[PDB]
Symmetry: C2
Subunit: 270 residues, 2 copies
């Protein structure tokens, strides 16, 4: 019954909004979109970063570039802190999806563990455009040009995403679309370790139906959109694979240090 799907879509959309601070609507208005009433603090150079990290609401480190920690490492470490926040926001949204909390606790952990990266890159695209990504609750903007002028290892760290984001955003999806999509991702069924796949695919199936209806009604002239969105899941997978790679590579730069114990402890890998 379409009566239930429309209902399921509104529920999830509602949770998505109350779960994620920066929405794509809120992000798009700030971005390319005009809507100028509080412009962001651009970061196009080493000086932009420095001459700004001391005036931007950031809770980790301040501008100190001169034989005192490097810029390429400070930015990466910075994205890990934030991704720990996102993981928490995603976990909360996961518990709003009908059926998720009723699943075996182990599988819930497995679904989150293996779906968090795909969700993050999907939402990252809401903050990015061909020229950069919004930063800090949408208070800054780190240009795409800067990010590529980063150290030898971090130079390819964000370029692939930018390429994915541009294609993904061409779909012109809104938060009500992304909400259902993000749920489909969480409720996969192919994640390794699942103890009871039936309920998971049962829910994904119901989420997939909602998503389909949501796209037909919300984008009536955008043919086969549903199909395009699902085939984007192939792109995210590579994005996640390719990500664990550069990670292992980075895991061969900074390592043995006695001050990282309880700090590294908080930032395992995901």
């Amino acid at each position: 019954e379409s009566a239930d799907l429309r209902a399921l879509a509104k529920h999830l959309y509602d949770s998505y909004i109350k779960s994620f601070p920066l929405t794509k609507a809120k992000a798009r208005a700030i971005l390319t979109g005009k809507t100028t009433d509080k412009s962001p603090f651009v970061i196009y150079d080493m000086n932009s970063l420095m001459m700004g990290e001391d005036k931007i609401k950031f809770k980790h480190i301040t501008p100190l570039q001169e034989q005192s920690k490097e810029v390429a490492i400070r930015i990466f470490q910075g994205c890990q802190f934030r991704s720990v926040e996102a993981v928490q926001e995603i976990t909360e949204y996961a518990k709003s999806i009908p059926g998720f909390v009723n699943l075996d606790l182990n599988d819930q952990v497995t679904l989150l563990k293996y779906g968090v990266h795909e969700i993050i890159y999907t939402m990252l695209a809401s903050l990015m455009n061909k020229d950069g990504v919004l930063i800090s609750e949408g208070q800054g903007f780190m240009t795409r040009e800067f990010l590529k002028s980063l150290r030898k290892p971090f130079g390819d760290f964000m370029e692939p995403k930018f390429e994915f984001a541009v294609k993904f955003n061409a779909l012109e999806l809104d938060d009500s679309d992304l909400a259902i999509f993000i749920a489909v991702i969480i409720l996969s069924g192919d994640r390794p370790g699942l103890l009871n796949v039936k309920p998971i695919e049962d829910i994904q199936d119901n989420l997939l139906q909602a998503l389909e209806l949501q796209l037909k009604l919300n984008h009536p002239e955008s043919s086969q959109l549903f199909a395009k969105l699902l085939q984007k899941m192939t792109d995210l997978r590579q994005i996640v694979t390719e990500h664990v790679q550069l990670l292992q590579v980075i895991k061969k730069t900074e390592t043995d240090m006695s001050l990282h114990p309880l700090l590294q402890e908080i930032y395992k890998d995901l």
Copy 2:
């Protein structure tokens, strides 16, 4: 109109039969040991592989292996024969896809370059069951167990495809289904290098409509099969990749060998 779509499905199914000698239909008939009009010779060890050259058209070596192109090599030399055989075939099927031959000559080469291996592992699935795969046009059956006990590297060339096959075959798709799915794979548009994307996406958007109707009609009691099928394309991409990196391994540990030109031309790391 859903009538042109049905006509497209029929058209495609028709060219599919005309380009592929061993359909899933014939393959399943041979695999269901019940149908004994012509059963296969089961390869599951050296003696079997050895005797396999008597009841099959195995032009390879029957006697000693190691000091004369070991068993492993022999098996993959043939494998290589099949891919090129499949490429030429898939290449023939592609020309039947409406509009494909009208695309930019270069894009045609790109659609095939990235499409053909995803298609080969899709169709290869029709020849597998949890236990093994039919070889030499169904005349033979090589055990999954035997294939996995080969030399350190060659040993794990097929396992990831058997795992794909087991879950992909659970979808119970038939030749008329795969025909349209196989066409959706080629007419991607997200393939690297494509000079002209719009025209390509107009064809695929057409192929996806067809496939959607085909699945609803041919598998009415199968919810979200369409979606399930499209997500399977993510598995395909991954399989292609692990494969190439394996090929790169042999390329270094076997300098006396050779990866066929056509396959070499198609393959590019990264």
